[PDB]
Write an enzyme that holds these catalytic residues in place. Structure first.
Site, PDB file in Angstrom:
ATOM      1  N   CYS B  91       0.779  -1.212   0.049  1.00  0.00           N
ATOM      2  CA  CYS B  91       0.014  -0.035  -0.222  1.00  0.00           C
ATOM      3  C   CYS B  91       0.845   1.255   0.144  1.00  0.00           C
ATOM      4  O   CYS B  91       0.139   2.314  -0.599  1.00  0.00           O
ATOM      5  CB  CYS B  91      -0.991   0.029   1.245  1.00  0.00           C
ATOM      6  SG  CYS B  91      -1.814  -1.521   1.496  1.00  0.00           S
ATOM      7  N   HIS B 356      -8.968   3.369  -2.801  1.00  0.00           N
ATOM      8  CA  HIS B 356      -7.752   3.123  -2.435  1.00  0.00           C
ATOM      9  C   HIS B 356      -7.050   2.405  -3.624  1.00  0.00           C
ATOM     10  O   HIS B 356      -6.893   1.176  -3.771  1.00  0.00           O
ATOM     11  CB  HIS B 356      -7.636   2.096  -1.109  1.00  0.00           C
ATOM     12  CG  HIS B 356      -6.239   1.680  -0.809  1.00  0.00           C
ATOM     13  ND1 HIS B 356      -5.018   2.257  -0.880  1.00  0.00           N
ATOM     14  CD2 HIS B 356      -6.014   0.484   0.139  1.00  0.00           C
ATOM     15  CE1 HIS B 356      -3.971   1.750  -0.553  1.00  0.00           C
ATOM     16  NE2 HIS B 356      -4.518   0.618   0.109  1.00  0.00           N
ATOM     17  N   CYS B 386      -0.291   2.118   6.221  1.00  0.00           N
ATOM     18  CA  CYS B 386      -0.472   0.909   6.694  1.00  0.00           C
ATOM     19  C   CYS B 386       0.011  -0.146   5.639  1.00  0.00           C
ATOM     20  O   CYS B 386      -0.361   0.122   4.328  1.00  0.00           O
ATOM     21  CB  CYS B 386      -1.723   0.312   7.552  1.00  0.00           C
ATOM     22  SG  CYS B 386      -3.249   0.757   6.824  1.00  0.00           S
ATOM     23  N   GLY B 388       0.465  -4.266   4.077  1.00  0.00           N
ATOM     24  CA  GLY B 388       0.401  -5.823   4.240  1.00  0.00           C
ATOM     25  C   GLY B 388       1.939  -6.609   4.657  1.00  0.00           C
ATOM     26  O   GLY B 388       2.830  -5.747   4.238  1.00  0.00           O
TER      27      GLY B 388
END
Ligand SMILES: O=S(=O)(O)c1ccc(Br)cc1
Ligand SMILES: O=S(=O)(O)c1ccc(Br)cc1
Ligand SMILES: O=S(=O)(O)c1ccc(Br)cc1
Lengths: 729, 400, 401
Positions: B91, B356, B386, B388
């Protein structure tokens, strides 16, 4: 590059060579050093000669048929060699299975049809041979089984069993239904799932049917003859390869589901099977086969495999071989079986005694309340007729063996008595002193007790030499262990006649000398007490359950505590208190009894009352009682999870050692099988006695590392973890 | 060493997944459209100074494969010496491209660098590139793999965020996004997507549901790679004190699957004066951190403390905070841990309302905070995401 | 300039060949983890929390190589979860771009100790598996005049006048210098053999090498084994319109081999090296990035090498060793011709023609090769450069410490 184990500068020969006028070579397997065909050093060399001869004579061979001259087709390997493989022997382990698979791979890509004539059981290395063939015919003979049960010995199918099944049925289906649990199939089920192609009646028509299929296959399908589906130009794996968009969507969910079914237990065999199945489906068959060998060698050299091979092969054989059977005694047939008591326990005893072809005389109080015992036998048979596991003729003769009654005179011919009325030592004394004179002088008088000693009960009979303690588990129809409790008066013959009875009803017997709690009930107490002790110390109840499940137990401890009433634990906690306080000895109460009494004071006795550590609605388990964390101040003590797992495993292991020291158990094989099948000790340990010699952690491996870790727990959690002197110098 | 300023920061609108306007647009053209917009703003700019084009892309496959940054350089007619590299840090790929571009300028060996992201999730869905942690059981087993959706629910279970607590935030993100669009806060940075004829395809973030109500959010059913068995029991094997996971996240309080792209021009002060460009913001500091891979989305918490430590600043000195709204519970925990004021957090709405676009979200929420610092005449902002696998990236900027 | 980037370690796996290769059964993730574990053996008491990021180049980040394989290597190897992980793709120079970016990040002051490298399992993930804008966007393929790197090399040999004997003479030179370096023991400390989960050996040497190469065998080969499809000769000539006919001189014997492999480089500041008790082996003096025409594609090392010489204020004679990835024989022959490089200073330990070209990992392999050859000769500087698809170029000067 070779088909043989050695290639530099003398075993027997297993395979016979039969070529006919047509050109069909019949490879009949017949190992002269044992009544069963098995994958030892003799076979690998014998099949090496046969495969080399198939190639050098291929210009005159039309097809191959593989059969066996035994009552079985093929089963297993040389376990006495595999249990000794050391980590520095991984190169030898790798080369061996690679040699085994290069033989099958040449036989598979021979360009000619190869048919397996399965005359009986084909298990492990046996089904792996048949899977290399292009056609499989099995006879629907009694006792025949097919499967790959290597995972039950801490192994995996390393002779192409993983590479070919994942290639015949896809990744998911092959792993779930065949590989992950090593399920064994009867020929009718095997022909349905795809392992077997054809079926015949008797074994006499197997080789003629195999040669008849070779002759027809060469005529109708001349090109694809002797060519497996994955060696064709347009092969597509069922369910797709890991590259397929449909499989790659659910492929990440396979390891997570495996952690659910294993609950996090450290059992590395299903992990390696799933890894070799997926990584193998990404490459060609030959590269996939070699990946299978590397994961196979990783398990054979490991300790978890040595633990399972010890328990489920050697220890289980030594028990079924009559190890705990008194020496030299013969058999006395069991004509009629009087099962006094027809409750939950009494019903299961009569069922498994009737399912073994013996006549039963169920006796109780109320003919109405004693009909529930036979109604439990009909509830099972009606479920078995629906599943197709028994016939109406086989189900009626079973219930005909059961003779429900209430008269004491209907014992003229009964030579075997099991009492499972209910639990009260004084009440047991009087009810026993009734049939003793009515039955013949050679009639055994058993008793189903969980903690009450037998020798005290034996005083209420004249023939005390025939008073014994046969302890069954709930439910009797499924639980495989039978704990035979030897009293002071029990003779060598009366014990052996019970040992023979257990094997007749298809169960596992262990012999235990008279003692409080004996073995099963005594060891399982330390497991639940150690967990409730952790609950009182301030450990989260969810952490306690996760510690029990990740240790490998079948049921978490706090959950198990509600399944066996907390007041039943309190009653035993008083009977043991009165036991020591009558021999002039003081009694130190376990710190768990404060938790038991705190729950009983709160009115939460377990499952029957409807409230314990869990809450119970609709008969099912809901969740942990939300007030449990506030009652015992959960969260105050946060030890590491590995210490909780060890506290529960070490308490049962040290208690098993105290049983072997006090002569309660005679051999270590009974301690392992009694713990694995009786109370549910995790199978990866191989038994509560194997766990000591096979311990493995940061302190090392072996009895010395076990003592080190036991003392490490002693300095932090209490001196009940200090090891006995029998484990020390 | 050398300071790295932001000279331009634009982004396309975000088209929704189901029946999206941007579904027919190749993800390469989403970037070429933004390059042509920079040219229109600075025609006299010497493009030979642009020494690299660094694009973030989480699913570099198919339409987004073959180094889409190099395809953007060639297709847009840029100088062939302008490089072009694609990277992937999940991300934070959009923010890591900017951070790397700022770090290359700080090292001195680069003058002017374009950085940004692109992700057409309606054409190349997430997880289309395969993956090692997912499509290999031996690693999936050992690292205890679990999706972000499960880890976000576990954050809500541990911290006590109820279903109403996370749905109340999603309403706040919908309102601040609708109020920001009305005030024209985005009219200058949102470059509408057009076709080869000049016709309008999309000029607004169509994933927004501005008329969202608290009642409508309650009727949404929880969406918890999930709905496939296992991942609930795996998380509790590591978080053994938690008994059950309270699945509070739905499609209304989680970020939206959208298509979009973003571009950020970065260069030294000498490159600005030589080209006649007005520096808008200065990269003060960056940081990389991470947390447990089973809870996953708690990486922004140590990454924000690590970047405030480098700039020698505190939470008070940061006027605007901008955390990506991957899941509502992740932003709430971030507000609770660092005690962030309520009126400083995601002031113009977030990914719950607008979407997103994975590889481009980092460069979108950065260009949003450059716009807002100018409009408010404020001084500092902090942007974090944040990641993954349990990572975290943060960046501090200062208005010039 | 205040914080200088240093190289403390530089290792790589042996390169297994494409057909019947020894590394085809090994996942590309396992190649990286093995190199991580080897750095643990060499420095057992290193605080891995100082490691701030892992940067891996990968040209085909799909399948086994997808999902940010740098982050998968951090988790699988058991490194601290704070050790980052990023995958980048700049075609053939992805390995060197990771080393340069890790150096730029150390200089910027926001990173203490960074791992950089590459991985490419071309036998499991063939080149072109990651799709691509070309082909899936014919309007872009048509506009940019796409020509594969195979024809671009044949076009360089046609324009510069490199005969079939000229490109095969270099191919034999690369084979000979590789076998001399191997048997001489130059690669003993850097080539970390690949082992299975039981410790058994899978591969320990560069098996793509054919050390018994002769001039005659190289002449019996056939050219151009996508390139065998129609159009690309006409598309290339429509761009280079003064050439009449392209001479196909490149074969599998004078082109870079398709191999599997991976490499790692530990880069950090001087302060971080003293904190962990590490001894620096080289210094990143300057890095540069440029590019050339996208049709001939392979050219690009020349304006990037000249750019990295001006950035470091050095000339060709000041550089002791030159290392260019031998993607094709004619590319290195033009590079030597343009900058007038002596034969003895160019790819001294052989190159990709003999040992292979593991796309994403090559930049980190040839760099680590120059770190050893500088110490073994006690030379000073070395220049590493790579030709790139699309037309790009990357160069890096290192100085022995
Ligand atoms: O090493 S051998 O090939 O002789 C061999 C080892 C174990 C087993 Br079980 C069978 C044979
Ligand atoms: O090295 S051993 O001879 O003990 C050996 C054991 C198991 C297998 Br399969 C092969 C060889
Ligand atoms: O028949 S089994 O598959 O259970 C089997 C037993 C022993 C060995 Br060694 C291999 C296999």
């Amino acid at each position: 590059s070779s088909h043989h184990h050695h290639h530099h500068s003398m075993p027997d020969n297993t395979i016979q060579w039969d070529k006919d006028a047509d050109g069909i070579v019949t490879l009949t397997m017949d190992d002269p050093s044992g009544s069963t065909n098995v994958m030892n050093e003799a076979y690998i060399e014998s099949m090496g000669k046969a495969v080399d001869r198939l190639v050098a004579e291929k210009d005159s061979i039309t097809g191959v048929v593989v059969a066996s001259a035994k009552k079985t087709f093929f089963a297993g390997g040389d376990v006495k060699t595999m249990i000794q493989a050391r980590p520095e022997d991984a190169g030898d382990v790798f080369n061996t299975v690679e040699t085994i698979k290069r033989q099958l791979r040449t036989l598979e890509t021979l360009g000619k049809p190869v048919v397996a004539a399965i005359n009986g059981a084909a298990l492990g290395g046996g089904l792996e041979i048949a899977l290399a063939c292009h056609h499989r015919i099995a006879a629907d003979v009694k006792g025949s089984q097919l499967g790959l049960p290597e995972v039950t010995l801490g192994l995996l199918p390393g002779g192409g069993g993983v590479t070919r099944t994942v290639r015949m049925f896809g990744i998911q289906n092959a792993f779930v239904s065949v590989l992950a649990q090593g399920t064994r199939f009867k020929p009718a089920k095997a022909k349905e799932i795809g392992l077997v192609d054809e079926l015949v009646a008797t074994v006499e028509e197997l080789v003629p049917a195999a040669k008849a299929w070779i002759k027809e296959e060469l005529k109708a399908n001349p090109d694809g003859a002797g060519v497996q589906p994955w060696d064709k130009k347009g092969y597509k794996m069922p369910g797709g390869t890991p590259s397929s968009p449909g499989l790659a969507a659910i492929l990440p969910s396979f390891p997570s589901n495996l952690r659910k079914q294993l609950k996090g237990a450290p059992m590395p065999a299903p992990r390696a099977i799933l890894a070799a199945a997926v990584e193998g489906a990404q490459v060609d068959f030959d590269t996939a086969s070699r990946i299978e060998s590397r994961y196979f060698a990783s398990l054979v050299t490991g300790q978890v495999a040595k633990n399972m091979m010890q328990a489920f092969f050697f220890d289980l054989q030594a028990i079924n071989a009559g190890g705990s059977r008194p020496e030299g005694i013969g058999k006395t047939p069991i004509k009629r079986i009087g099962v006094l008591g027809a409750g939950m326990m009494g019903a299961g005893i009569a069922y498994v005694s009737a399912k073994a072809g013996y006549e039963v005389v169920l006796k109780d109080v109320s003919l109405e309340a004693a009909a529930k015992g036979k109604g439990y036998s009909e509830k099972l048979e009606a479920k078995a007729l629906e599943r197709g596991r028994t016939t109406q003729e086989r189900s009626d003769a079973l219930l005909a063996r059961i003779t429900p009654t209430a008269d004491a005179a209907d014992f003229k011919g009964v030579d075997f008595v099991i009492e499972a009325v209910f639990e009260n030592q004084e009440l047991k004394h009087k009810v026993f002193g009734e049939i003793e004179d009515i039955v013949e002088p050679n009639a055994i008088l058993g008793s189903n007790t969980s903690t009450l000693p037998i020798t005290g009960l034996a005083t209420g009979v004249k023939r005390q030499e025939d008073f014994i303690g046969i302890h069954f588990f709930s439910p009797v129809d499924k639980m495989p262990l039978v704990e035979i409790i030897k009293g002071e008066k029990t003779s060598d013959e009366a014990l052996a006649r019970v040992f023979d009875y257990t094997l007749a009803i298809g169960k596992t017997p262990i012999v235990v000398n008279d003692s409080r709690g004996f073995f099963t009930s005594r060891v399982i107490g330390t497991f639940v007490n150690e967990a409730l002790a952790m609950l009182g110390e301030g450990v989260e109840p969810a952490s306690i359950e996760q510690a029990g499940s990740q240790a490998g137990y079948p049921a978490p401890p706090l959950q198990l505590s509600d399944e066996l009433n907390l007041e039943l634990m309190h009653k035993i906690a008083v009977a043991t208190r009165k036991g020591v306080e009558d021999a002039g000895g003081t009694y130190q109460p376990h710190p768990a009894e404060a938790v038991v009494e705190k729950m009983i004071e709160l009115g939460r006795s377990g499952r029957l009352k409807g409230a314990g550590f869990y809450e119970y609605a609709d008969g099912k388990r809901s969740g942990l009682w939300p007030g449990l964390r506030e009652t015992f101040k959960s969260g105050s003590s946060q030890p590491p999870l590995q210490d909780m797992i060890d506290r529960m495993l070490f308490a049962e292991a040290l208690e098993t050692q105290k049983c072997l020291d006090e002569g309660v158990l005679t051999s270590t094989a009974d301690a392992n099988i009694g713990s694995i099948m009786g109370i549910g000790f995790p199978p990866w340990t191989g038994g509560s006695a194997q766990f000591i010699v096979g311990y493995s952690g940061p302190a090392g491996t072996g009895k010395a590392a076990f003592v080190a870790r036991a003392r490490e727990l002693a300095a932090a959690y209490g001196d009940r973890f200090l090891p006995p002197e029998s484990l020390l110098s | 060493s050398e300071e790295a300023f932001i000279y331009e920061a634009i982004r396309t609108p975000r088209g929704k997944q189901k029946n999206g306007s941007l579904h027919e647009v190749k993800p390469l053209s989403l970037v070429v459209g933004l390059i042509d917009e920079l040219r229109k703003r600075h025609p006299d700019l010497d493009e030979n100074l642009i020494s690299d084009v660094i694009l973030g892309c989480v699913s570099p496959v198919g339409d987004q494969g073959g180094d889409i940054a190099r395809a953007a350089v060639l297709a847009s007619g840029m100088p062939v010496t302008s490089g072009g590299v694609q990277l992937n840090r999940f991300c934070a790929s959009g923010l890591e491209a900017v951070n790397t571009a700022a770090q290359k300028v700080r090292s001195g060996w680069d003058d002017l660098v374009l950085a940004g992201g692109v992700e057409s999730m309606s054409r190349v869905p997430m997880g289309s590139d395969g993956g090692a942690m997912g499509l290999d059981p031996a690693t999936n087993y050992d690292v205890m793999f679990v999706p972000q959706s499960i880890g976000a629910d576990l954050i809500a279970t541990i911290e006590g965020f109820s279903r109403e607590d996370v749905d109340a935030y999603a309403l706040r993100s919908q309102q601040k996004a609708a109020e920001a669009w009305s005030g024209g806060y985005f009219a200058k940075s949102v470059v509408p997507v057009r076709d080869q004829n000049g016709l309008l395809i999309l000029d607004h973030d169509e994933h927004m549901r501005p008329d969202t109500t608290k009642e409508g959010l309650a009727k949404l059913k929880p969406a918890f790679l999930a709905a496939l068995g296992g991942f609930d029991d795996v998380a509790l094997q590591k978080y053994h004190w938690v008994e059950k996971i309270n699945h509070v996240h739905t499609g209304g309080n989680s970020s939206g699957i959208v298509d979009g792209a973003a571009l950020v021009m970065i260069g030294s002060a000498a490159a600005g004066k030589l080209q006649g460009l007005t520096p808008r913001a200065r990269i003060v500091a960056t940081a990389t951190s991470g947390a447990d891979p089973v809870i996953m989305l708690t990486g922004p918490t140590p990454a924000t403390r690590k970047v405030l430590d480098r700039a020698g600043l505190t939470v008070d000195d940061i006027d605007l905070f901008e955390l990506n709204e991957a899941f509502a519970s992740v932003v709430l925990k971030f507000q609770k841990d660092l005690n962030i004021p309520d009126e400083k957090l995601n002031v113009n709405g977030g990914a719950i309302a607008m979407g997103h676009p994975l590889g481009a979200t980092g460069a979108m929420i950065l260009g949003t905070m450059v716009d807002e610092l100018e409009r408010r005449n404020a001084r500092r902002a902090l942007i974090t995401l944040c990641i993954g696998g349990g990572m975290g990236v943060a960046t501090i900027i200062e208005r010039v």
